[PDB]
From Swiss-Prot, chain A:
UniProt-recorded name of the protein: Flotillin-1
Shown chain mapped onto the complete sequence: 212 to 264 of 427
Subunit-structure text: Heterooligomeric complex of flotillin-1 and flotillin-2 and caveolin-1 and caveolin-2. Interacts with ECPAS.
Stated family: Belongs to the band 7/mec-2 family. Flotillin subfamily.
Summary of the function given for this chain in its UniProt record: May act as a scaffolding protein within caveolar membranes, functionally participating in formation of caveolae or caveolae-like vesicles.
Domain of life: Eukaryota
Coiled coil: none
Localization of this protein: Cell membrane; Endosome; Membrane, Caveola; Melanosome
Underlying gene: FLOT1
Amino acid sequence: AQRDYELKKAAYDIEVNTRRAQADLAYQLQVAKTKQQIEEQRVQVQVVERAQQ
Amino acid sequence: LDVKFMADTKIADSKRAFELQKSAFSEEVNIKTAEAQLAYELQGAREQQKI
């Protein structure tokens, strides 16, 4: 009876840990994507600055 | 004493069946325990790829 319960617990824990790992790291991925858009415009100022110089 | 030793044998044969099955069940538990512990890295390393 203990074994029958232990195996389902471990089986469900695989999915819970998997989904938690995804959710945990989901923030930094978007932070990278957002910075990707930002940096393009940060250095775009250099182009405009040089053009007036 | 003759009956004693015979009683001790039947207690041992009962012991035998139990410890044998504990071992079989523990193998299964131990196996899926490792996976439950390490799944965070299997997913973590896989997510660092996109990051």
